[PDB]
């Protein structure tokens, strides 16, 4: 079950290649034997891991995802394309292509949102190859995701132009970049269970963006996924200037210290409107890095806890990323 | 004792827009794939048919309207002329 993706595709390809060569050399390439080879491979590919729902679609998705990630460096773009072309041979034989599409969409979504894809051209070439192999249907959700990412550049340019075309140049005071994703195509269904009071520094960008975006699209309604959202917080309060890549919740917590050197759990909760679990995890992720101190004999967090900004914070790198699991 | 704005990010994504009625070209719910497409989800065309909206402020399954454009190009929900303006699944 742990390396099913790689081993499954390679094993099916070896079997396929052997028999194509046999049929061409010994059976004069007869289409009835080729059809028998294809039926045999279809019955074989529809394999499911022990106690699991059919995993071949998930495995093919994980494999293709591994080939499409930047980690295939040491392999050229051409070798990845040959490996993917071979993968398409296997992909045709999957019964539940929509299941592949939703797992691939989940892997591809994470690859696209976090920029883990080797090249956009390789992802598109893959989606077009899958389209030639399985038809439009199979790529419809994937093609829409890839389309949302490609149209996101024009959407950001439209937003920057929307701001420049208002009678007053509305300087956002922050660099704002955004990706708007279609909910029927994407497997991003995490509605924010916290009415996160967005920091004042972000609020202007958020409201101008909601006004701007609502003009163009429809269907299942995407909404601020503040937990997937990140930004940079620069600490100028220390003897060395530090830049922390932080989540929007971490950012909000750190931004509360702009109002005071000490902040209570309740003030952070009232100002950020985060739920207790995510606020606690957020604060904890700042405490573990020692960016904040806990003024209670416990270094760990309760509703009565007060936090003090760590005036003695030091890190080995001037720029660092606090990765909370919110992404 | 400073921590001030220079280059933040964060992300707020979209207000709303669901279409509540039925695609008059085949008479099935506008947000699902069209009847010919949902019934044949294994066909090369099927999953493509999500919501497409016209200047008519009415919407249809993308293949049904693209097929219907062989007929007079009017929306069968209000008979106004069709031109694609919004999209959604």
Swiss-Prot record, chain A:
Coiled coil: none annotated. It is found in: Nucleus. The modification N6-acetyllysine is found at residue 62. Neddylated; which enhances the ubiquitination activity of ECS (Elongin BC-CUL2/5-SOCS-box protein) E3 ubiquitin-protein ligase complexes. Neddylation leads to structural rearrangment in the complex that allows interaction between the E2 ubiquitin-conjugating enzyme and the acceptor ubiquitin. CBC(VHL) complex formation seems to promote neddylation. Deneddylated via its interaction with the COP9 signalosome (CSN) complex. Core component of multiple cullin-RING-based ECS (ElonginB/C-CUL2/5-SOCS-box protein) E3 ubiquitin-protein ligase complexes, which mediate the ubiquitination of target proteins. CUL2 serves as a rigid scaffold in the complex and may contribute to catalysis through positioning of the substrate and the E2 ubiquitin-conjugating enzyme. The E3 ubiquitin-protein ligase activity of the complex is dependent on the neddylation of the cullin subunit and is inhibited by the association of the deneddylated cullin subunit with TIP120A/CAND1. Component of multiple Cul2-RING (CRL2) E3 ubiquitin-protein ligase complexes consisting of CUL2, Elongin BC (ELOB and ELOC), RBX1 and a variable substrate-specific adapter; this complex is also known as ECS (Elongin BC-CUL2/5-SOCS-box protein) complex and may consist of CUL2 or CUL5. Component of a ECS(VHL) or CBC(VHL) complex containing CUL2, RBX1, ELOB, ELOC and VHL. Component of the ECS(MED8) complex with the probable substrate recognition component MED8. (Microbial infection) Interacts with human respiratory syncytial virus (HRSV) protein NS1. The Cullin neddylation domain restrains the RING domain of RBX1 in the E3 ubiquitin-protein ligase complex; this restraint is removed upon neddylation of the cullin. Belongs to the cullin family. This is Cullin-2. It comes from Homo sapiens (Human). The lineage of its organism: Eukaryota, Metazoa, Chordata, Craniata, Vertebrata. The chain holds residues 332 to 658 of 745 of the full protein.
Curated annotation (Swiss-Prot), chain B:
Pathway: Protein modification; protein ubiquitination; Protein modification; protein neddylation. Zn(2+) 3 binds at residues 56, 58, 75, 78. It catalyses: S-ubiquitinyl-[E2 ubiquitin-conjugating enzyme]-L-cysteine + [acceptor protein]-L-lysine = [E2 ubiquitin-conjugating enzyme]-L-cysteine + N(6)-ubiquitinyl-[acceptor protein]-L-lysine; S-[NEDD8-protein]-yl-[E2 NEDD8-conjugating enzyme]-L-cysteine + [cullin]-L-lysine = [E2 NEDD8-conjugating enzyme]-L-cysteine + N(6)-[NEDD8-protein]-yl-[cullin]-L-lysine. It is an enzyme of class 2 (transferase). Changing residue 72 to E: Impairs UBE2R2 activation by neddylated Cul2-RING(FEM1C) complex. It is found in: Cytoplasm; Nucleus. Belongs to the RING-box family. This is E3 ubiquitin-protein ligase RBX1. It comes from Homo sapiens (Human). The chain holds residues 20 to 108 of 108 of the full protein.
